[PDB]
Design a protein around this ligand. Sequence first.
Ligand SMILES: NC(=O)c1ccc[n+]([C@@H]2O[C@H](COP(=O)([O-])OP(=O)(O)OC[C@H]3O[C@@H](n4cnc5c(N)ncnc54)[C@H](OP(=O)(O)O)[C@@H]3O)[C@@H](O)[C@H]2O)c1
Ligand SMILES: NC(=O)c1ccc[n+]([C@@H]2O[C@H](COP(=O)([O-])OP(=O)(O)OC[C@H]3O[C@@H](n4cnc5c(N)ncnc54)[C@H](OP(=O)(O)O)[C@@H]3O)[C@@H](O)[C@H]2O)c1
Ligand SMILES: NC(=O)c1ccc[n+]([C@@H]2O[C@H](COP(=O)([O-])OP(=O)(O)OC[C@H]3O[C@@H](n4cnc5c(N)ncnc54)[C@H](OP(=O)(O)O)[C@@H]3O)[C@@H](O)[C@H]2O)c1
Ligand SMILES: NC(=O)c1ccc[n+]([C@@H]2O[C@H](COP(=O)([O-])OP(=O)(O)OC[C@H]3O[C@@H](n4cnc5c(N)ncnc54)[C@H](OP(=O)(O)O)[C@@H]3O)[C@@H](O)[C@H]2O)c1
Ligand SMILES: NC(=O)c1ccc[n+]([C@@H]2O[C@H](COP(=O)([O-])OP(=O)(O)OC[C@H]3O[C@@H](n4cnc5c(N)ncnc54)[C@H](OP(=O)(O)O)[C@@H]3O)[C@@H](O)[C@H]2O)c1
Ligand SMILES: [Mg+2]
Ligand SMILES: [Mg+2]
Ligand SMILES: [Mg+2]
Ligand SMILES: [Mg+2]
Ligand SMILES: [Mg+2]
Lengths: 262, 244, 248, 248, 261
Amino acid sequence: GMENIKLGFMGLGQMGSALAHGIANANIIKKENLFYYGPSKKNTTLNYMSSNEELARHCDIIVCAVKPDIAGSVLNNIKPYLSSKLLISICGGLNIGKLEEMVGSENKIVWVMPNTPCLVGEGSFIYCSNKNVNSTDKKYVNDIFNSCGIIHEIKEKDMDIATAISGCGPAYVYLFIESLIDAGVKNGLSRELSKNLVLQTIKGSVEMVKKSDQPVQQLKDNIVSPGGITAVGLYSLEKNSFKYTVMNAVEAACEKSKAMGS
Amino acid sequence: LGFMGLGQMGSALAHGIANANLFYYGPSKKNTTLNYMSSNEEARHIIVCAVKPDIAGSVLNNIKPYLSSKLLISICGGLNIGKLEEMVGSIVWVMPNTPCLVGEGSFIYCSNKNVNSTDKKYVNDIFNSCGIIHEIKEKDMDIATAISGCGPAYVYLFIESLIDAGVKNGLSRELSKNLVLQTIKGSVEMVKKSDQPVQQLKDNIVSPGGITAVGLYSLEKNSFKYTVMNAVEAACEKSKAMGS
Amino acid sequence: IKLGFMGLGQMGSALAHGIANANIILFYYGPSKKTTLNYMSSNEELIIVCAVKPDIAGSVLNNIKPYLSSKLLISICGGLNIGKLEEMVGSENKIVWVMPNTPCLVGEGSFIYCSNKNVNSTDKKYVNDIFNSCGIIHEIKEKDMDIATAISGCGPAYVYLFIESLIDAGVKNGLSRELSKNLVLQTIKGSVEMVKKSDQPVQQLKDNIVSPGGITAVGLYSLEKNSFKYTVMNAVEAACEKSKAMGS
Amino acid sequence: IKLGFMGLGQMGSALAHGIANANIILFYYGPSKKTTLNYMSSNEELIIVCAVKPDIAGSVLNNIKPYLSSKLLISICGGLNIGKLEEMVGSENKIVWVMPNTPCLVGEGSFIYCSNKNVNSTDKKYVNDIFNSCGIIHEIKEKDMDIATAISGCGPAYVYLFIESLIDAGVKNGLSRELSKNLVLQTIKGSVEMVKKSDQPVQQLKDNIVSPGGITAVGLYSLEKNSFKYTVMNAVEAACEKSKAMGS
Amino acid sequence: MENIKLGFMGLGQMGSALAHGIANANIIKKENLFYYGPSKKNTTLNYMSSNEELARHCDIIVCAVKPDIAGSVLNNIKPYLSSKLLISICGGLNIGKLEEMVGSENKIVWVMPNTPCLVGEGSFIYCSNKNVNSTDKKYVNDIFNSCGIIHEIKEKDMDIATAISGCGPAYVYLFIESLIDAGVKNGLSRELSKNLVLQTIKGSVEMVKKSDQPVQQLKDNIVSPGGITAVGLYSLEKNSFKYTVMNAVEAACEKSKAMGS
Ligand SMILES: NC(=O)c1ccc[n+]([C@@H]2O[C@H](COP(=O)([O-])OP(=O)(O)OC[C@H]3O[C@@H](n4cnc5c(N)ncnc54)[C@H](OP(=O)(O)O)[C@@H]3O)[C@@H](O)[C@H]2O)c1
Ligand SMILES: NC(=O)c1ccc[n+]([C@@H]2O[C@H](COP(=O)([O-])OP(=O)(O)OC[C@H]3O[C@@H](n4cnc5c(N)ncnc54)[C@H](OP(=O)(O)O)[C@@H]3O)[C@@H](O)[C@H]2O)c1
Ligand SMILES: NC(=O)c1ccc[n+]([C@@H]2O[C@H](COP(=O)([O-])OP(=O)(O)OC[C@H]3O[C@@H](n4cnc5c(N)ncnc54)[C@H](OP(=O)(O)O)[C@@H]3O)[C@@H](O)[C@H]2O)c1
Ligand SMILES: NC(=O)c1ccc[n+]([C@@H]2O[C@H](COP(=O)([O-])OP(=O)(O)OC[C@H]3O[C@@H](n4cnc5c(N)ncnc54)[C@H](OP(=O)(O)O)[C@@H]3O)[C@@H](O)[C@H]2O)c1
Ligand SMILES: NC(=O)c1ccc[n+]([C@@H]2O[C@H](COP(=O)([O-])OP(=O)(O)OC[C@H]3O[C@@H](n4cnc5c(N)ncnc54)[C@H](OP(=O)(O)O)[C@@H]3O)[C@@H](O)[C@H]2O)c1
Ligand SMILES: [Mg+2]
Ligand SMILES: [Mg+2]
Ligand SMILES: [Mg+2]
Ligand SMILES: [Mg+2]
Ligand SMILES: [Mg+2]
């Protein structure tokens, strides 16, 4: 049972709308029980509400989907209306300590880190919660995000690196896909065909990792025919520090999450 | 259906078709469900040339008299139709990848003058059972090989690098793997479903003054895009070099 | 209203001459006479524009401090935020921080502004009307002024250098400088017009020009090799860092 | 006159729709139906525009070879020069090599052309009128076509990426994508307008924006660090090399 | 030593390698080897209900957990370590940090192992506090010399020794991995490349071990004037091979000191 509880989204930006419509299409909560507020009305199936305060006073679970720089004032305005209610924050960088500083230690605070793929029911989520979040609250959190993806409960200290991989990850994958298509378009292939060949190559590779008992590096080794084509392409990636480039990008994002966390 | 050579690609392609619902030869017997045959010459058969390109010349020379009205399919890298017609006489050239083992392979092919629409129908059915196949121009085979054939290795290293970054900064290797694979799965799904181009989907994740922006800026610094494009082009160049 | 431009240098003149050619509303002072605007004996001599360099703006604004009662002070000084400006003239004064660019000289400027508590709707109405006459003005947050400066204020310099580099490339490979310039400016004019009119994003418009196996794909590959995007981004961020450092 | 666009892809459509919106003079063929232009059964079916990719242009022009008698053939294929074109249809035909860009869709294209011996003043008058209606056209030497392509033809892609990188920099540092875009496009619009109107050279216009000890000087220093000029020049030259290689 | 009870707190990658390394050496009875983890492991060692129970039961306690949770784990076993030998394999966490976690009253020894101890070829360095005597060091030496070679070194030298001996295998694995990839790229099979690589390294180590000539002279010996080796060695200098190896070690040593701060 989750059809009766009222879900409220404070802000419907790029992540807010993706998460809102991700849960809406999953059908675990009734359409008339999904609410939102923004300074401007959005093209959405969710029910508009007059303010964040009236959203917090009506809804049972409140989602903070605003930018972290304006999250402090928004949460301060709904501060007295969070009594006995569950607050879920998707704000990047803002950890439980900073959130407890914004609304109070007495409230139920859970910090969830989503990604945009939840729109197509394939989101990746990580979360941590404060002292006041119980087993029945965690059951609500799990069911909401498992309906439009896969959720893990992790330590609070691991949230910054997880954000860098799971939250920011799509962007690295999008750019990877973008770069592979461009390489194809440059060397004779159409943009449509390049995209098909790229997406199917990645889909197959991911499935191989999941299903095979062999590690990723052995699966990589298997493709390298002695004196062949793949060996030359991989040699090029090593030359240009492909591994370090990816690792450095993730770590740079991880530092930014921690910098905002101070 | 006969596989000449049962190595990493041979076994992957063989078991991919077998699971979809078969003979092979190698200098050593392999741990496989396929039926072993005494030689490449043993005339019995669709013939798949799954040997390395450096030995394919002599191996195809041995089966030259036994290819009378038989459909020869070659998966050898670099060796184009002109190079193959020199080896067996004036044939379809198919470029697979290992993910066909789990029925999710990517294939591209071109055919000579002797291959008609009925052989093409069998070509499409054999490979669409364990993946997706496209008929392309022969000139496009080298770049397609670079992306589709070599591609999984680029992705594996991409996955490998993302896990390493998670491990380095506190996450367990197992959790890092789960998060990486789901993130990639979700992103690919977004591309093929969305009406927005991939770059706009990339823009949507960049919250102004946020974390992702710093990650992408780091990728631009170290020329991530050029790195990927240079790797594909290096492989494409090698494919054309062996085809010369 | 009577405008007074304190400093008539490179930005002071460009702004003053931009509003003058717009015909909507002019006085100035400098240590040396410069212009169609009417010269005045000093800065103290009685809307006021502070168009001096930030290193001398401290003493210059401190001299006109007791003379800015019920008068609208607009500052175009880079880096010096409202916090720094209220330290220079006082919290009680009506202060608005506007960031212009030189293209306002030809009536095509880009402006961003923020204002303190004392600036009201009627004051903002004047500010908006003054700068929309010779360009486009946006009211933004004070925190966003540093990045907005780095793009809108410093921007022309990146674009001039962009034009400069494209012309040089044409000249190097056989084209005359005049023809190279003509082709470059039109190519950019058409591209800018394509972005604001097309429903497709800028990257899709970029994808449309890339013919498979073609010429554009090779040039665009060269830009990726030399980290073109990072280079542009690093420059804007470096400028943004400088603006915040001066505001500290 | 009756225009016929052989190929209606990314450039074919942009050019055809550019002249269509200009209202001065329309037919097309493709392997798949696309547009307001009238579809025709084949390329052979009877001014002709060859708007296909250069790799297939050889056979495509060879099919219409006996049908181009006393007809003006304009080719927009990149790399394929008049020497390569006269090999494809014959020396006796009237051939003109025009290099367009996609901005002609919004009536702001940039064109360069050269023509063989058989193209006369009346043929050039038509060519000039067709392309001046949706942009600006210049007649240049054939030898200069490769560099002119690299700048005017491929140019929009460099400008789109320039716009793309500036927007990303704004987004990274707190600005919304919509505002970043607005500021970027206006900043560039004003800069382009400053170059064509000012009597000062582009580098002097760049010097005017650099305040001593200021913000611009730091961003411009960052561009010099990352070889911004070379990057732009290397890209144009790389494209120019590609155009000549395809023309060989 | 068959009678003393050894306990491992955490059987991860290093925990299990050290545990099974000692187990295969047969110096301590099978029934006398104990472990605890939040999840039961596929191991020959006897499972125990908690770390506190493990501390109460065993004569020697091994801290094989990650350094970020070692503080709370050692805090829980704090009242159960009286007269017992505590050995810590945690990276970065020096004696100062350990005495801060359990108290300077305890017998604390900091040992830095590597996974090669699983095949009885581990490299160990150790330092101990004021309370660890000669008889305790007798136990330490015999435990780790059974599955490798142990050295007693200065506490200040532990960070660089960790960077070489502890982290070392990873560099060697990558080195081996890279040499195979080079063979595979240029026509050799993965199996043959591996065999040639491992034998080449095995022989080279033995030459450094047994020769009166320094490593650099042994290097010079293989370089024939105008030959093949010269070209390969020049390529390594071009891409700063020596610095790369040295920088990696220093970056690791830097990280060990940062955690020890
Ligand atoms: N991912 C990929 O690996 C991939 C992708 C696309 C295309 N390909 C193509 O597939 C071909 C094989 O690649 P691979 O990676 O599988 O190489 P591989 O692992 O070396 O496989 C070659 C196999 O052929 C066998 N063989 C050797 N000599 C033979 C002979 N005289 N007659 C018959 N069989 C013989 C070998 O058996 P033994 O093991 O007993 O020596 C070996 O198992 C290459 O041409 C490559 O271009 C591979
Ligand atoms: N992929 C991702 O983008 C992603 C992934 C993981 C986490 N996140 C997190 O999600 C949050 C939002 O990111 P985003 O990318 O969606 O940014 P965004 O697109 O700028 O979304 C912010 C939205 O909040 C609205 N808003 C502004 N002020 C408000 C207020 N006072 N009360 C309620 N709503 C207000 C805005 O509406 P208007 O448009 O009308 O101004 C805007 O649509 C960030 O904290 C980020 O860390 C994002
Ligand atoms: N494109 C741009 O240049 C640009 C863009 C945005 C913002 N800004 C801002 O505009 C301000 C000025 O920039 P700029 O490039 O115009 O610098 P500038 O060319 O050096 O102009 C400063 C002018 O102020 C005059 N001046 C010097 N001391 C004075 C005083 N004590 N009282 C009154 N006037 C005095 C100087 O006159 P003399 O010539 O007689 O010495 C000089 O012409 C800076 O704060 C900058 O942040 C400039
Ligand atoms: N910005 C630019 O893209 C640009 C700028 C300057 C010059 N050019 C030049 O313009 C030419 C085309 O460029 P593009 O970017 O438009 O490439 P494109 O988007 O691939 O357009 C080519 C079009 O030709 C059609 N086509 C294919 N085979 C044909 C045939 N046998 N007969 C007639 N039409 C056929 C295709 O139709 P289907 O879609 O049905 O396959 C396709 O739409 C190139 O030669 C290039 O050098 C382009
Ligand atoms: N080669 C090496 O890895 C190496 C070399 C030298 C030194 N070290 C040192 O050895 C230590 C562990 O390294 P590692 O690579 O083995 O990390 P690891 O593979 O993550 O092992 C840590 C293990 O501790 C367990 N654990 C977690 N919480 C526990 C608790 N409260 N009580 C008892 N056990 C708990 C975990 O069990 P679950 O799996 O059930 O969570 C995990 O298996 C580190 O301090 C490191 O500095 C490692
Ligand atoms: Mg996938
Ligand atoms: Mg059967
Ligand atoms: Mg007047
Ligand atoms: Mg008409
Ligand atoms: Mg050895």
